[PDB]
Amino acid sequence: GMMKDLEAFRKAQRADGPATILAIGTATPPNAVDQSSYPDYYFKITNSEHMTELKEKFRRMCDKSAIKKRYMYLTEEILKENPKVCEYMAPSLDARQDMVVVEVPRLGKEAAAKAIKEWGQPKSKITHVIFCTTSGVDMPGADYQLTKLLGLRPSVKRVMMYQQGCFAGGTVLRVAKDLAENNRGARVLVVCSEITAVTFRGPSDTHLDSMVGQALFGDGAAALIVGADPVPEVEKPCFELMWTAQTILPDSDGAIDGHLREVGLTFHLLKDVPGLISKNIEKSLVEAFQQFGISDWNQLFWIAHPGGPAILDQVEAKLNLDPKKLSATRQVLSDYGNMSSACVHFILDEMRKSSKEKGCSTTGEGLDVGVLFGFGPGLTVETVVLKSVPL
Amino acid sequence: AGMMKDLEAFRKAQRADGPATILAIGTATPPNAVDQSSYPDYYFKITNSEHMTELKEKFRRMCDKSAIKKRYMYLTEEILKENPKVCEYMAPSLDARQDMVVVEVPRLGKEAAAKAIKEWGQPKSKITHVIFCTTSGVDMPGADYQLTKLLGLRPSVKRVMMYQQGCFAGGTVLRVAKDLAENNRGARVLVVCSEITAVTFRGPSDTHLDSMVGQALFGDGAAALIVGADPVPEVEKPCFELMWTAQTILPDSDGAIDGHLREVGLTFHLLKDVPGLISKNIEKSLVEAFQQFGISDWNQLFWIAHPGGPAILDQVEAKLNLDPKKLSATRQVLSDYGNMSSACVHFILDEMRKSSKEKGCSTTGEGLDVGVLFGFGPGLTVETVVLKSVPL
């Protein structure tokens, strides 16, 4: 049948044009946590109310975090029910898994429903599913639970991405690009859902770097629809994927390790992550942009994973970016904190929306081409080159 | 403006022309070979369960029926002697198990990849992508980063790390590899599946017989492939082409295979009639894959099926009236290696091409042009890969 012209089959089977983002939805747990009052809340709920000096150390970390609030599934009531999670290093993985194996696909489905609504196509047109999370693992995975919760077709092609950490927001785009571009009609639902129940723990005045996560990490899920060859007048791209890369930074061994253990997930930073990123990022820009004749990085619209404010500040200084470049990035960090893989997609959403509100000519702040970066364990840097769409 | 002058031209230049092909297969096993015939004695001894005489006989029956003669295991007596909590049915042991597999999984995976790269014969700098798949352990950075560092691949390889999927994932890594290779001109994809049972190994319980099954069937192993489109003539040598893929969740199969990673390590919760579910539904999957190729006779396909156990194989064979030879390569790998989870169908691919060459067949798939690979695992998920052989 198709066996007598397999070149014809291969050509019919693949898409024509570039992968595009056709919709973005986001969701968070309902409970907003004010950063100004977090130190007091966190030392009370971890029964450390009376560790005065360490409390002020954490207050200082929070005040320099450039975060105003975060959303968290972990409420005071839940922590009351789960005292082992409020301790610094108690056996608590089972407890944490019992939470996140449910909440991760639940929050993800909430984001996906909003993306699907925007997209406006029936959910039976979804052909692929990429689920990304760093909180908990289970078999079948969160990709399976989402498929069930959403009532997608049994035959969706799923890619389940566990435990990759903060660069993975870039990774899901890199995977989605290939899936959508190589399969005609393919519509990829991408979900990044991050819940900090797996990392939350009490303070230790002999292990201060564990507090950094307690100041920075928030909860959130983002969902995208990705597909090539958008139907005219029906589907509405907001960005096109042009090119991707992934690399491990030199001399970055052990910069950010994460171990899933009986005490849950613990992170360790052994090197200067902002310094590593800012010293090397311009090489990634040249690698990505020379072929497109772009060398002035202020002519790009920017999305950078906001692992902490120091990364943003040092990247901006090293590249001499105009202070407006990272504005959308800084705004999501301020309103949501660091939601790991979900973050850059919240930033894409904020940018295309702020751009329509400001009367910009494109979804990329009036500019044609831009860049999205994810940063995480390796030290790994994900680069995605984006095209905006006219507004 | 460079490539901005014509991004349509760019998308055409950036993608490959032809189908993804398998250019090499390498495999590796831990050194310690475990004879099934003596395994009941050994297992009940090392888990300090010799007094459970009736439980042992149940286990001896499981082993006698397993259609497995040999497995390989990272876990040795000595290692188990150093880790008594791993030998218990249910003791806090995740940390000890992680400490093992976070190192052994990439280690064994590197061994398999080195063999595959050697067969391929091209510089390792030409590897552009890496897919690493395992159901044993998790860590940040992942086993994929470890493999990259161990092989000395380019810092810029594009990695897809696939943790905790289970036994269908041998099909999954092909499905992913197919899109990476076909959509990127020049791309050469290192695919590694590496599986170590130290994460699930535990002692017996007479109130959890179904949990004992996995102790009879699971073995360790790693497989590596090089996948790419547009093979370089007379320099690269394809053994299979990837034509078409699907993934599906079988009806009425909720909870049939659940695996939970807990403080006690990896534990499974099993329901349903899995061999019934697969054999009941598999022809639908065949018809979905092969009607477009005008193939309707399942005996005209060469076959690779994940050997979850011999009942799966027997009931698929009965259901479809396959000739008994159809699953020969599948059963041979099961006999020599046990069920090595995601790695298993890749050992069978290797066995398929090697037996075909040795028997003097006209193709890498037993003289047939087209074949099918199936992965089976949690979901219940079925992965389907349509394969082309290559002439010999």
Swiss-Prot record, chain A:
One of its GO terms (biological process) is polyketide biosynthetic process. CDD domains: CHS_like. The keyword Transcription does not apply. InterPro entries: Chalcone/stilbene_synt_C, Chalcone/stilbene_synt_N, Chalcone/stilbene_synthase_AS, Polyketide_synthase_type-III, Thiolase-like. It is an enzyme of class 2 (transferase). Gene3D superfamilies: 3.40.47.10. It catalyses: (E)-4-coumaroyl-CoA + 3 malonyl-CoA + 3 H(+) = 2',4,4',6'-tetrahydroxychalcone + 3 CO2 + 4 CoA. GO terms for molecular function: naringenin-chalcone synthase activity. The active site is at 166. It comes from the Eukaryota. Its EC number is 2.3.1.74. Pfam families: Chal_sti_synt_C, Chal_sti_synt_N. Pathway: Secondary metabolite biosynthesis; flavonoid biosynthesis. Keywords: Acyltransferase, Flavonoid biosynthesis, Transferase. Belongs to the thiolase-like superfamily. Chalcone/stilbene synthases family. PANTHER family: CHALCONE SYNTHASE, HYDROXYMETHYLGLUTARYL-COA SYNTHASE. The primary product of this enzyme is 4,2',4',6'-tetrahydroxychalcone (also termed naringenin-chalcone or chalcone) which can under specific conditions spontaneously isomerize into naringenin. This is Chalcone synthase. It comes from Pinus sylvestris (Scotch pine). The gene is CHS.
